[PDB]
Amino acid sequence: FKTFGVPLESLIEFEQDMVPAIVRQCIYVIDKFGLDQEGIYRKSANVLDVSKLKEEIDKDPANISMILPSKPHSDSDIYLVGSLLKTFFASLPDSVLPKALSSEIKVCLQIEDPTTRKNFMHGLIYNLPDAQYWTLRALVFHLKRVLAHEAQNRMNLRALCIIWGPTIAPANPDDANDVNFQIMAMEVLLEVSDQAFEPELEHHHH
């Protein structure tokens, strides 16, 4: 049972919440230990450390336990988990925003009116199948938390879209080398997330 390089659909049969265990785990680690870490996601962990952890998880899905930072934790273990999460999305056979949405994404990106643009993207998001919908929701909420902590992590919106856009969004169908298409798709996605996805549940009853 492999984790990386397989369709997102095939991973969520185990999960009642429809987000793969590896994605939940990595986000938990960065949420708890990494939101204030300078250069989180901008820092590329050692490719050999990403590979070792990747391969261990592919051998046994129970090895997502290894993603939790062993005590005492180090900066580089946290960087590693960020790079691992990015590699997960990059290794998916299809983009989490599917290639088939390219044309409708192109249409979306020409719309000058912001309200029209976000409602348009909402429609695209609402129509995603479950696996993509719930997984994209978890990742987008996480990335917005990262942005909320910019004063410490020094990640601006555009840097975050350079890092994540080519991983999440499909390429320009009319131009394979245009990096701005995926970057802009990522910005519109972040902008719309407040209205496109239901909020995470609130845990305070004191």
Curated annotation (Swiss-Prot):
| Record localization | Cytoplasm
Q: Where is this site: Arginine finger?
A: R42
Induction cue: Induced by stress including low pH, heat shock and oxidative shock. Basal and acid-stressed expression level is regulated by transcription factors MSN2 and MSN4 as well as the HOG pathway.
Superkingdom, according to UniProt? Eukaryota
Q: How is it modified after translation?
A: Phosphorylated in vivo. In vitro, phosphorylated by IPL1.
Domain called Rho-GAP: residue spans: 6-197
Something else known: Present with 1500 molecules/cell in log phase SD medium. Lack of RGD1 diminishes the PKC pathway activity.
Q: What does this protein do?
A: GTPase activating protein of RHO3 and RHO4. Acts in concert with MID2 in cell integrity, which is functionally linked to the PKC pathway. Involved in various stress responses. Required at low pH for activation of the PKC pathway. Important during mating response.
What's the name of the protein? RHO GTPase-activating protein RGD1
- Which organism is this protein's natural source? Saccharomyces cerevisiae (strain ATCC 204508 / S288c) (Baker's yeast)
Protein encoded by which gene: RGD1
Q: Which residues of the full protein are shown?
A: 467 to 666 of 666
